[PDB]
């Protein structure tokens, strides 16, 4: 088994529709899943979206599972481009976008044949439900667009202030912080933050984090090497993911030095405070155990999940494993472990959190939580 963690089925038996899709899916098949903080999951499977309420209870009359027809695309559809919006199955509205910018909206998951459409050199990476029952569609070049369904049936759209898109402004991730009505984007060179209301956004800041964290990053990895000064100017750093916890913002960054022998990739969690519109002096870099050999830059894939805002614990995951890591001082952090989901065709198709519980959706075992044994 795992040493410090139980990894077991979370929730009740999956919906029949999900079962099929999984049992039918072949390791050629790309499956992606959006596991939503609200308690609902979306499985993007070939040309449909199956959406279901994660059933913490086994009871049938509580059971909800809907299948929605996706808007045609030549590209694979992506659960990163599917977002749920809840008022307060009727409560649940749904929006999907394609890589080219086609939008399909359902005001209610109850009415599956009822939806409205719209459209936005552009590739779209994420769609995120934000406040006022609206969404932000983010492009790979980081043009950010607000999309707001109107009761008429139209979908209003506008670009965010200073968010025209494309310095390299390639987008890595966005983060929506509901309690503070804040939307952030992490690009290859900076972090930007907007403050929203139900219909607009005000640009709060853009930090050049490459300038800020660079030395902290190289210093935490190669800093004690006899030849640190020579080393550092050749270091490559890529910022990959952005989450938050009570310590503030948590950034996942990969760093490497071509000329190292053996050349490994170091993955670090960087925590900084978001206080006002400027950075503090206090940056903590925590180098994780996930330290694979460098192969190619296209192959540097790794995502971050932070289920519990307050223990200082992060899960890095790729398609084959999940690494339980700690951030911050590590005082309250769980034991550091690697959990393998690589065996017998198995794979990590997605991850998220349900009620502050780390949830993984595995090809062989469905939804699974990772909970400490102590």
From Swiss-Prot:
> What tissue specificity does the UniProt entry give?
Widely expressed in fetal and adult tissues. Expressed in the brain and kidney.
The UniProt subunit note reads as follows: Forms part of the Nup160 subcomplex in the nuclear pore which is composed of NUP160, NUP133, NUP107 and Nup96. This complex plays a role in RNA export and in tethering Nup98 and NUP153 to the nucleus.
Q: Which organism is it from?
A: Homo sapiens
Q: What does the record give as the function of this protein?
A: Involved in poly(A)+ RNA transport. Involved in nephrogenesis.
Residues bearing Phosphoserine are 57
This protein is called: Nuclear pore complex protein Nup133
Mutagenesis / variant outcome for changing residue 345 to R: In a breast cancer sample; somatic mutation
According to the entry, the disease involved is:
Nephrotic syndrome 18: A form of nephrotic syndrome, a renal disease clinically characterized by severe proteinuria, resulting in complications such as hypoalbuminemia, hyperlipidemia and edema. Kidney biopsies show non-specific histologic changes such as focal segmental glomerulosclerosis and diffuse mesangial proliferation. Some affected individuals have an inherited steroid-resistant form that progresses to end-stage renal failure. NPHS18 is an autosomal recessive, steroid-resistant progressive form with onset in the first decade of life.
Per the record, what is the consequence of mutating residue 223 to V?
A: In a breast cancer sample; somatic mutation
Full protein stretch here: 75 to 477 of 1156
Q: Which family does it belong to?
A: Belongs to the nucleoporin Nup133 family.
Q: Where in the cell is it found?
A: Nucleus, Nuclear pore complex; Chromosome, Centromere, Kinetochore
């Amino acid at each position: 088994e795992s040493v410090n963690y139980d990894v077991k089925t979370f929730g009740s038996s999956l919906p029949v529709k999900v079962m099929e899709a999984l049992t039918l899916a072949e390791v050629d098949d790309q499956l992606t899943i959006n596991i939503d903080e609200g308690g609902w999951a979306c499985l993007v499977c070939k040309e449909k979206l199956i959406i279901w309420k994660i059933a913490l209870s086994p009871i049938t009359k509580l059971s909800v599972c809907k299948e929605l027809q996706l808007p045609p695309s030549d590209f694979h559809w992506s659960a990163d481009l599917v977002a749920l919006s809840y008022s307060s199955t009727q409560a649940v509205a749904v929006m999907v976008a394609t890589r080219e910018g086609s939008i399909r909206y359902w005001p209610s998951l109850a009415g599956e044949d009822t939806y409205t459409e719209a459209f936005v050199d552009k590739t779209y990476s994420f769609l995120t439900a934000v406040q006022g029952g609206s969404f932000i569609l983010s492009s790979s070049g980081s043009q950010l667009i607000r999309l707001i369904p109107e009761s008429s049936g139209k979908i209003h759209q506008h670009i965010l202030p200073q968010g025209q898109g494309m310095s390299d402004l390639t987008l890595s991730s966005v983060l929506w912080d509901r309690e503070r009505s804040s939307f952030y984007s992490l690009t290859s060179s900076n972090i930007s933050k907007w403050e929203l209301d139900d219909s607009s956004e005000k640009h709060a800041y853009s930090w050049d984090i490459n300038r800020a964290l660079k030395e902290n990053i190289t210093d935490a990895i190669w800093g004690s090497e006899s030849n640190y000064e020579a080393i550092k100017e050749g270091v490559n750093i890529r910022y990959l993911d952005l989450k938050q916890n009570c310590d503030g913002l948590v950034i996942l960054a990969a760093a490497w030095h071509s000329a190292d022998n053996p050349c490994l990739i170091y993955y670090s969690l960087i925590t900084i405070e978001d206080n006002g519109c400027q950075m503090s002096d206090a940056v903590t870099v925590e180098v994780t155990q996930y330290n694979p050999p460098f192969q190619s830059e296209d192959l540097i894939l790794c995502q971050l999940t932070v289920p519990n805002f307050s223990n200082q614990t992060a899960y890095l995951y790729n398609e084959s494993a999940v690494y339980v890591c700690s951030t911050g001082t590590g005082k309250f952090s769980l034991p550091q472990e690697k959990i393998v989901f690589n065996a017998q065709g198995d794979s990590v198709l997605g991850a998220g959190a349900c009620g502050g519980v780390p949830i993984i959706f595995s090809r062989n075992s469905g939804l699974v939580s990772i909970t400490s044994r102590e």
